[PDB]
Write a protein that binds this ligand. Sequence first.
Ligand SMILES: CC1(C)OC(=O)N(c2ccc(C(=O)Nc3cccc4cccnc34)cc2)[C@H]1c1ccccc1
Ligand SMILES: [Zn+2]
Length: 210
Amino acid sequence: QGTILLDLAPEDKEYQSVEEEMQSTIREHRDGGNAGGIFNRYNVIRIQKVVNKKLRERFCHRQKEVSEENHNHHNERMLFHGSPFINAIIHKGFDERHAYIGGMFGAGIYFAENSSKSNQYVYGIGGGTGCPTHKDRSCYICHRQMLFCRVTLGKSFLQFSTMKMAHAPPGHHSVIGRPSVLAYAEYVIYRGEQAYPEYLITYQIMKPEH
Ligand SMILES: CC1(C)OC(=O)N(c2ccc(C(=O)Nc3cccc4cccnc34)cc2)[C@H]1c1ccccc1
Ligand SMILES: [Zn+2]
């Protein structure tokens, strides 16, 4: 009736597959490292497969509705997600009702194909105040969490700013905010059921060597 978290052994292609997309999609942001910390690597501590019967039905049902509406193409993609509510999401699923609505963002649940971008949001908008214990946005101690999810994009509406809206334009099912002078892409959905929390990644950002 709940979520069963299955551990993937590091020696499995799947575990290697997930950590590679994580580690390789890192980049350097204009932030100066202020939001997500200064690092050029992650120490991956754990990768778990999230299993919830209900969650994948809700997810599959919505995915059929979108295919219906998209000339039978649901346009699913594997994207990263970061926010301070990861533990609620793996048990209750994604929820559009907890979704901000203004400031720089709006009405949606954001996803990124860059893991370093989803990391900026682990502790909050901009990094919040950092970790609960040392109020440091660049902690190398505390274990952070992020999700590598299945996201049904459907017909995506492409534009430059997202803070904008609260639902998707007519005929579309997602919004891709793209780069101007943003830096990287951001995928937004306005329905929780259009995304399934496939993998739970437990990790730390590593401190640069020398
Ligand atoms: C900026 C925002 C709109 O972009 C997102 O993708 N956000 C977001 C926030 C919450 C969720 C979410 O699904 N939350 C929750 C789901 C289920 C139970 C919950 C219980 C308490 C809090 N959130 C819960 C999803 C996306 C937002 C958000 C807000 C704050 C920090 C990072 C991200
Ligand atoms: Zn800390």
